[PDB]
Write a protein that binds this ligand. Sequence first.
Ligand SMILES: C[C@@H]1CC[C@@]2(OC1)O[C@H]1C[C@H]3[C@@H]4CC=C5C[C@@H](OCCC(CO[C@H]6O[C@H](CO)[C@@H](O[C@H]7O[C@H](CO)[C@@H](O)[C@H](O)[C@H]7O)[C@H](O)[C@H]6O)CO[C@H]6O[C@H](CO)[C@@H](O[C@H]7O[C@H](CO)[C@@H](O)[C@H](O)[C@H]7O)[C@H](O)[C@H]6O)CC[C@]5(C)[C@H]4CC[C@]3(C)[C@H]1[C@@H]2C
Ligand SMILES: CCCCCCCCCCCCCCCCCCCCCCCCCCC(=O)N[C@@H](CO)[C@H](O)[C@H](O)CCCCCCCCCCCCCC
Lengths: 555, 51, 177
Amino acid sequence: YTRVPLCEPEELPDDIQKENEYGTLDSPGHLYQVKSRHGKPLPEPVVDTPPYYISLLTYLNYLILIILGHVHDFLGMTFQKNKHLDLLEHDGLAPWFSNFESFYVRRIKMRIDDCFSRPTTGVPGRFIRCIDRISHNINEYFTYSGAVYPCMNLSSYNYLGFAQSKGQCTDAALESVDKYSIQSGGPRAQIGTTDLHIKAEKLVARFIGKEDALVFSMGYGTNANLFNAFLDKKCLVISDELNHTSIRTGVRLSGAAVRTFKHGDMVGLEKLIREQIVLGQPKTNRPWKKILICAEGLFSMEGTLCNLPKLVELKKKYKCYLFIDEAHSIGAMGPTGRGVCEIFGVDPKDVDILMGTFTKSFGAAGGYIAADQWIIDRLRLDLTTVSYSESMPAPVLAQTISSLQTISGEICPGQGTERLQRIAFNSRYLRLALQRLGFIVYGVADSPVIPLLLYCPSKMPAFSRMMLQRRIAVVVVAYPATPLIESRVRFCMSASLTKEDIDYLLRHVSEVGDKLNLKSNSGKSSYDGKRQRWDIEEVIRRTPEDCKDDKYFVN
Amino acid sequence: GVRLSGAAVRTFKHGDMVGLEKLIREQIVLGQPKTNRPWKKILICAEGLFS
Amino acid sequence: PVTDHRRRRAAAVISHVEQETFEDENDQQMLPNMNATWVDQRGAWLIHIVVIVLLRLFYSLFGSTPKWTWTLTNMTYIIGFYIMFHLVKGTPFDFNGGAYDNLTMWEQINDETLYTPTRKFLLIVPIVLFLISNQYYRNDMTLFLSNLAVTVLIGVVPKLGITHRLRISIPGITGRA
Ligand SMILES: C[C@@H]1CC[C@@]2(OC1)O[C@H]1C[C@H]3[C@@H]4CC=C5C[C@@H](OCCC(CO[C@H]6O[C@H](CO)[C@@H](O[C@H]7O[C@H](CO)[C@@H](O)[C@H](O)[C@H]7O)[C@H](O)[C@H]6O)CO[C@H]6O[C@H](CO)[C@@H](O[C@H]7O[C@H](CO)[C@@H](O)[C@H](O)[C@H]7O)[C@H](O)[C@H]6O)CC[C@]5(C)[C@H]4CC[C@]3(C)[C@H]1[C@@H]2C
Ligand SMILES: CCCCCCCCCCCCCCCCCCCCCCCCCCC(=O)N[C@@H](CO)[C@H](O)[C@H](O)CCCCCCCCCCCCCC
């Protein structure tokens, strides 16, 4: 009962399974093509704020929580010690972790821990199956029963619907298993490399648009073990305040000086560049050996794009280097799927180093780096992962190659464009409908991530539980991951969902938000400068036609 | 000649090698004024017999 | 030792926290602190007035004399602010490796900048509160002296240009560098 059950697969006809994993389009009018911005720079984004009493209530709630938590800790650890034997010294040995460094997890998040780490089963397609559990004590231990129910999926990194068990990719993987075993001999330097590795590298280099590229087994290791190859203690790195932990770990391992600039502020970046060029190294004032700029394509927590032409002209003027991450932008953004470079029209030659990950769109696990010839030739000899780690397995390579070929158009014609049009239309329709209802939605017009703000801390468990009761899966984040005032729910859209599912979600979300009083719009979201409190039927009737027009989006 | 050249000039006391060594070390460490960049080269001038 | 990463506990009547080395300062303080960034945000300045008003109303609901009510509200506000800001040392979540284990939240505000508008406001509030409050208990000299002592010794001396990174070993051997 305490252990997680092993679920026996169910027997169903083929068509039901295909419909479960991937939906079938009803009308050809639910597709949209993405245009390219030639000479239109990105305008400064505009954000909306709620009234003051929300902030005051949030501050009071957090103050009460902190006071009672500290009082409980002190009284409990002073008046008794038998129960708290994991946080005190025993037989002259220090405890594993500290009391103060883990206050939040034990005192605030533990009471709402049922919303995290939810076990599932089956393919993570349109409908995801979940295993039920019963909370005991206060989210201390759980008891499981043999019952599984489906839920609508809005919490998985599946943009183009490549997570399927019936298709060309699965057959390719099975054939690869038949030919190549799952065994990997060792590091790529010794025995690991085969012909499929070269084929995948060449195909990736052709697809991205650069000269050559390499492949890796883990996305985290691509960043964690890269910067020490060509950086040292006499170089400067300028990075945004919002970057993934892998980049920070890699820079920390490298040892270079780090200076950060505020998100979406180019003037501060220019001032910092000028000051750092003038001043030089600390305590000696010698010039910097080189300067590197780090940035990310699409930011997942906000769904905003980076300004690429500004960075390109700044690096050309001041003789700097550029590094771009495209985890959330490859294969899902642009008229074809090349990335932000195709959106802005910037030639890929300008960017020195490009990176990507196959998990978010192509339904595999790995990463890549794309650069010029001599840079790659040197890095191959100077890298650590190549001659010290394992090698990529064959089924993952087969899946990635099949997905890239399908998206390019060599095989299975008329599929990639249809998927891209589906995802674009779904994202635009959902964002426009949510803004028309009266909520607060962040991001650019076409971004698969839709963050909805839920300010008061007590409104996250209620919303999550009510949505789960109505068979919709959601993900909620809070402090310290997000700012204290702003806590949000993230929506991940797919190309497998259908307009009927969106209508169902819209109805349920609207009624739940009306129940919980989550509608706070100040009129800056509307393009006509007026408050929008519409009806669900009117929105459903009018939005799909007006979703295609670009004049209804402020940004 | 040095005035016509335009280079920076620093003088040391006659018959005092310790001050010369200290000045050399300080000028090597400090660098150019207002920029602290290293000097391109350093030249030492002296006479054989002082009349 | 090949790393030489140790914490010192030198004992003296007057001592100061040593300046951070290159690795600890220029490299291990790069990401947002997430412990002092919320100060310069929305609604972070009226909340003190709201707290003062709520305390005054809560004490007045009891039905006591104005003198005791105002003395108690002043003492409670000042003691609470001191406990929150000046007493505790560290951060509730691991930052990089324990880089901020020798400084309080007050020192961490605005990246150790001495004079910022929020600091000016935080210093101004106690003085104005004292001037507003003293008008009810001017007759009693003992209460006036007590209020003045509390304000000066708790709400004025710590928020000064001096007593920055200042530690006294009287109540315990403090740790510096
Ligand atoms: C009648 C009237 C009614 C009204 C009223 O008055 C009476 O009612 C009273 C009710 C009172 C409260 C009661 C309780 C607390 C919590 C206390 O604490 C906060 C949390 C901690 C704060 O941070 C420190 O702690 C950091 C920890 O990292 C330290 O960090 C460094 O030092 C590290 C050392 O390793 C190195 O790694 C690095 O150099 C570096 O990281 C650093 O010193 C400092 O930042 C401190 O406490 C914790 O930490 C203790 C130590 O671990 C725990 O263990 C200790 O207590 C156990 C208890 O069983 C015993 O076994 C043992 O004594 C022993 O094990 C303790 O339980 C636990 O609370 C702060 C005071 C407060 C709010 C009182 C205020 C006054 C009242 C409101 C009175 C009010 C006015
Ligand atoms: C009906 C009885 C009376 C009720 C009144 C109770 C007391 C209220 C008096 C007013 C207090 C001063 C008000 C100023 C604050 C305004 C509102 C701020 C809102 C909350 C801000 C949260 C910020 C989170 C940042 C996280 C952080 O970094 N935390 C730590 C480490 O850095 C700080 O050390 C930490 O936060 C403080 C730990 C202090 C532990 C409190 C221990 C006291 C136990 C209770 C005893 C009573 C205390 C009050 C007399």
